[PDB]
Write an enzyme that holds these catalytic residues in place. Structure first.
Site, mmCIF file in Angstrom:
data_model
loop_
_atom_site.group_PDB
_atom_site.id
_atom_site.type_symbol
_atom_site.label_atom_id
_atom_site.label_comp_id
_atom_site.label_asym_id
_atom_site.label_seq_id
_atom_site.Cartn_x
_atom_site.Cartn_y
_atom_site.Cartn_z
ATOM 1 N N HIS A 1 36.296 45.245 23.092
ATOM 2 C CA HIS A 1 36.804 43.940 23.541
ATOM 3 C C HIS A 1 36.925 43.850 25.065
ATOM 4 O O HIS A 1 36.474 42.882 25.685
ATOM 5 C CB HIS A 1 38.173 43.702 22.887
ATOM 6 N N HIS B 1 34.981 41.402 28.033
ATOM 7 C CA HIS B 1 35.419 40.727 29.272
ATOM 8 C C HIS B 1 34.522 41.148 30.417
ATOM 9 O O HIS B 1 33.999 40.279 31.143
ATOM 10 C CB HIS B 1 36.884 41.014 29.618
ATOM 11 N N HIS C 1 38.310 34.840 26.163
ATOM 12 C CA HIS C 1 38.698 34.824 24.751
ATOM 13 C C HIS C 1 38.051 33.684 23.973
ATOM 14 O O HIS C 1 37.927 32.594 24.494
ATOM 15 C CB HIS C 1 40.216 34.764 24.664
HETATM 16 ZN ZN LIG Z 1 41.153 40.101 25.997
#
Ligand SMILES: [Zn+2]
Ligand SMILES: [Zn+2]
Length: 195
Positions: A91, A95, A101
């Site tokens: 995750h 980014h 998100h």
């Molecule tokens: Zn995040």
């Protein structure tokens, strides 16, 4: 929520990296596993940094990441014992690659409800949408299964009080096991990956 800003796309998909001090061998192996997962599915490559000015640093720091390539120097991924598992690192690398998100997509209101009555007071900012000029979704629809999607009760006042609820049939949200099909498809478009 892929960044629309071309300068945030790492050049040729090359992401130089440093692993900081203070990690265990097992933790370092997880960072490498997470990088190799991205490399398996997309054309992004992670390169041990030599003299590059801009690079990512796996940094021992409290849990709590810049999206895309910041430029002008290193950028840190903060890793502690509460946020060092493979899927969490995947995750965070999402980014790095250029994803905000999923729930912050400018079209998110077509897909999820933000349940304002349940958000912890003072945590509302986490649910703000990106402006439409900041995200270009590349023709890919909203992905409930994204590694970048919050769980149903993130920042909630209660464990069984949802703060995000899909609007139609409900798809599970918040997985942190592997890149979704949508994550991969969208990353490939963002990086113009050969196919
Ligand atoms: Zn995040
Ligand atoms: Zn997505």
């Amino acid at each position: 929520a892929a960044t629309s800003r071309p300068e945030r796309v790492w050049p040729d998909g090359v992401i130089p990296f440093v692993i900081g001090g203070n990690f265990t061998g097992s933790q370092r192996a997880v960072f490498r596993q997470a990088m190799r997962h991205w490399e398996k599915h997309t054309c992004v490559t992670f390169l041990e940094r030599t003299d590059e000015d801009s690079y990512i640093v796996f940094t021992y720091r409290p849990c709590g990441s810049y999206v895309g390539r910041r430029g002008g120097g290193p950028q840190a991924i903060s890793i502690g014992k509460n946020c060092d598992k493979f899927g969490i690192v995947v995750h965070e690398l999402g980014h790095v690659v250029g994803f905000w998100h999923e729930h912050t997509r400018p079209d998110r209101d077509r897909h999820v409800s933000i349940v304002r009555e349940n958000i912890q007071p003072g945590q509302e900012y986490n649910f703000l949408k990106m402006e439409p000029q900041e995200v270009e979704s590349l023709g890919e629809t909203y992905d409930f299964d994204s590694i970048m999607h919050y769980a149903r009760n993130t920042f909630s006042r209660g464990i069984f009080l949802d703060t995000i609820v899909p609007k139609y049939e409900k798809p599970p949200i918040g997985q942190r096991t592997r890149l979704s099909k949508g994550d991969i498809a969208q990353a490939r478009k963002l990086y113009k990956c050969p196919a």
